Amino acid sequence: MPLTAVPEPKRRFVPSKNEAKRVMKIVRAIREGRIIPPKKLKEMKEKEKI
Amino acid sequence: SVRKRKMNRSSVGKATRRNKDKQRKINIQSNPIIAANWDYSLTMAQNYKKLGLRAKLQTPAGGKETEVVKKLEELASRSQSEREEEWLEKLYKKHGDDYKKMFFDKKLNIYQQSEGDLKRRLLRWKKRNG
Amino acid sequence: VKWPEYVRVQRQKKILSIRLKVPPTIAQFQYTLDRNTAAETFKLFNKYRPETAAEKKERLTKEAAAVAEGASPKPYAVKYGLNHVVALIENKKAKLVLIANDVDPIELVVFLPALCKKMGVPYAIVKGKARLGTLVNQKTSAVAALTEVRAEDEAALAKLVSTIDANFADKYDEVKKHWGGGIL
Amino acid sequence: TSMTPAPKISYKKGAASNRTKFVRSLVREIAGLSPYERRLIDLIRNSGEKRARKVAKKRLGSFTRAKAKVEEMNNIIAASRRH
Amino acid sequence: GAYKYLEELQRKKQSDVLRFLQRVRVWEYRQKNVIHRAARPTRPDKARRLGYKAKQGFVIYRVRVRRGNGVNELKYQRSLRATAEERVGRRAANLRVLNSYWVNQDSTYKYFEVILVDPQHKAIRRDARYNWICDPVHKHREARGLTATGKKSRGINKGHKFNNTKAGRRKTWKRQNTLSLWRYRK
RNA sequence: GUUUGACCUCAAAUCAGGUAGGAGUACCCGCUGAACUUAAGCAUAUCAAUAAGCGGAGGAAAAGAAACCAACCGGGAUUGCCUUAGUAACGGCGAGUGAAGCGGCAAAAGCUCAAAUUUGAAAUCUGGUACCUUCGGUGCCCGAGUUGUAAUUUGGAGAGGG
RNA sequence: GUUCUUUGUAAAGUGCCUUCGAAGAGUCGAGUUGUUUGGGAAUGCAGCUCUAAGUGGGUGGUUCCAUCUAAAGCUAA
């Protein structure tokens, strides 16, 4: 047996909530318009540096 | 003295502050009901017994409804997000009320949540809707 | 010739590393995994680079740019902190624990090979904390573990365990004995 | 009358703790022995616990120190020789 | 975890592993300067439980002091550890001495590893767990014995045994040696 | 491969940005430390854990949330005042030194780390840099960092689930 | 007071059930010389020798009992 009988948490099986927090922070930043999305970042360089 | 002798002799001028009368009489600030009904001629403890309120909960060393009704008058007197709502829409439309099946579903209940969490959140969804 | 102070110090420390008799919990290091098995351990371990800060940032902005406008399994990576590796080992969540031979205070990782032999965790002392660092987005790592694995790499990992058991643990059963560093 | 008070720290005095017993014994085997303990374990096999406790008491602080220490060394011998 | 293995490892100091570690390092520290900076803690476990966080603004300095003191027993009743802490306080005058620990010892020298916080560093000035050291009431805590070892040497604790030095021996002397006279004489 | 590249340690730079010294010093925290004197002449002792010297702080400092006190029908961080009280104890039991608990009162306030895996994801931070509503915020970049920065946890337990 | 923002399956708290569960070493201590205290109980501290344990350990009280949690840190009046 392992040394301690510590019950495994839900978060070790469930998709991570820290990841969900970061994602739902960038979501806000896109609604506000302070992070330009990765799809439009190509379009900003397809028109520029020619 | 050495420094005071020069400062009382110099043309710089003293930084005179007459803040002695302000030390005794400090205006009451935290409650406008008390701020209107506080006799400044009376003391602290006299203004407490005048209003009715107990000033010291321990019995003091030494020898010792007009407004409290107004206080009693003013003292007797969480939504869900777009994604959470749409998630509960999916669960209800696919299952309905079978919470055992609803929580054993890998596709919609991605966070492996209990039955109690689901029935509480769905009733919040149902109260805000029809 | 005349060398600097620090150059003389590290050369003196090098010859001091050889010429002293050393306790057998140390010199259990330097009796380390050979070139072929080390390259073959990394041919597996390189398939599980922890997602670098740039890669994680771009992907989680891809989640935002897609999911906010218009299912995935838990991904597997190597596990790399000493608090976390000695957590994983003793919980028996470790299938291969890689230990660096060169650590700044040696006293840090001295219990680890013998704790791995205790728990039944198939360990390998590999050469270089820099070389462990490369597979893990860090300068140095001291320890690298492989808990869970994709099924394509599972059979290779199990054989990597058996190769390391035969190559490392069987050739170096004498290393629990024998005080190292008696070089004349 | 009494009111059955709340339990404290050293009432469950030294709660067993399976893990720390393991850790102490894990370091004990790895670290080797201190030069006096190295003499002490030779002294049990040759001269016995009599002189072993005598040296241990002079070396350490009190007699209760020497009890726990010679017994500790007797368990080093009991494990190393048999099992 | 990992530090419990370290903690209980460093409790055995004459044990053959730590004997060898201490043999190499005592010589290696002699070859360097008296007060020099450590790249990182040698004992990260004891550093951390004395409050070393491995982040920007946290410094480890290694220090050396001579041992000892009836001319050869004219005493000097301040510790070796407080002497060490003060010397690193002067060479690194921008920092603030947080704590110090023992690392290696010898016939002539006892060694220490002082831990130092940069109160001017912005990674210390934020984070509300460590920005207490930026308050100017901590300018040279080691010079006034406000560190762990200083509070020991002052004899500051609780009880019967420390009555002569519980609020500080100078303070209690001055207080109890004062003819207090009231307006209406007691 | 006699090559190239990771690290580790140690340097330098009128590098970018910071910071330390000196003054004042009543009080406060330390270090260091006498003598005249007083004791019968006098190595103990006394003046005195004083003065002088040296360092270090602030509006207060220090102390402080028990490895505390007690022996009760138990109190409950520290500090300060009255009391204990010239009491207990020390001392050629000489000159002399000399508290503390309790009780009353002033004022009151509590907390934080390290040690058990975030491991379905270093979630943390500094700097540079472009804007903005600038004791800061946001974007991007170089880094620090797994030899451990974040969140959770401190015995009054606490944590994972239901 | 008036007003603009709040969100994300986000952060807590209460009671019960259920499963677990670490606590500061050249440190305590012992000896020792020196200093220091009202501290005779050896009061504190400093140097040097030696140096621990976890149903631990310390401190008190007539077979035992009581009460603390050291060797990490902050905090007004």
Interface of E with D (CB under 8 A): 4-5, 8-9, 12-19
Q: Residue C180 carries which DSSP code?
A: B
Distance CA B71, CA B34 (A): 10
Output the domain CATH number for residue D35: 1.10.10.1760
DSSP H/E element including C143: strand C143-145
Which partners does chain C have (≥3 C-beta pairs < 8 Å)?
A, D, E
- Whether any strand G atom is under 7 angstroms from the Cβ of E101: the reply reads yes
The DSSP bridge pattern shows strands C97-100 and C123-126 to be parallel
Output the domain CATH number for residue C183: 3.30.1330.30
Question: What tokens appear for E92 in the block?
Answer: 């690194």
What is the signed CA dihedral for A8, A13, A18, A24, rounded to 10 degrees? -150
Method: cryo-EM
Per-residue CA distances from E118 to C31, E99, E112, E114 (Å): 42, 13, 19, 13
CA of E173 to C1' of F102 (A): 23
Q: How many domains does chain C have?
A: 1
Which partners does chain E have (≥3 C-beta pairs < 8 Å)?
C, D
| Contact by Cβ (8 Å): E117, E138 | no
Distance CA B41, CA C91 (A): 74
Q: How many domains does chain D have?
A: 1
Give D54's contacts (C-beta < 8 A, 6+ positions apart). Answer: none
The DSSP bridge pattern shows strands E58-66 and E36-38 to be antiparallel
CA of E147 to C1' of F59 (A): 22
Output the domain CATH number for residue E107: 3.40.1120.10
- Closest CA relative to residue C25, chosen from E7, D29, D24: D29
Min Cα–Cα distance to chain E from D47, Å: 23
Distance CA E52, CA E46 (A): 9
Query: Residue C169 belongs to what domain range?
Result: 4-184
Backbone angles phi, psi at E14, to 5 degrees: -100, -5
1-50 of chain A touching strand G, CB 7 A cut-off: 4-7, 17, 20-21, 24, 27-28
Query: Residue D81 belongs to what domain range?
Result: 1-83
Of A4, A15, A38, the CB nearest to C65: A38
- Whether any strand G atom is under 7 angstroms from the Cβ of D80: the reply reads no
Residues of A in contact with D19 (CB under 8 A): 3-4
CA closest to C1' of F19 belongs to E94
Return the ∠ at Cα E113 (arms to E112 and E115), rounded to 5°. Answer: 140
SS3 sequence of chain D: CCCCCCCCCCCCCCCCCHHHHHHHHHHHHHCCCCHHHHHHHHHHHHCCHHHHHHHHHHHCCCHHHHHHHHHHHHHHHHHHHCC
DSSP C91-129: TT--S-EEEES--SSGGGSSSHHHHHHHHT--EEEES-H
SS3 sequence of chain E: CCHHHHHHHCCCCCCHHHHHHHHHHHHHHHHCCCCEEECCCCCHHHHHHCCCCCCCCEEEEEEEEECCCCHHHCCCCCCHHHHHHHHHHHHCCCCEEEEEEEEEECCCEEEEEEEEECCCCHHHHCCCCCHHHHCHHHCCCCCCCCCHHHHHHCCCCCCCCCCCCCCCHHHHHHHHCCCCCCCCCC
β-sheet bridge partners, residue E62: E36, E113
CA of B22 to C1' of F77 (A): 35
Residues of E in contact with C108 (CB under 8 A): 6, 44
Query: Residue E70 belongs to what domain range?
Result: 1-186
CA closest to C1' of G30 belongs to D61
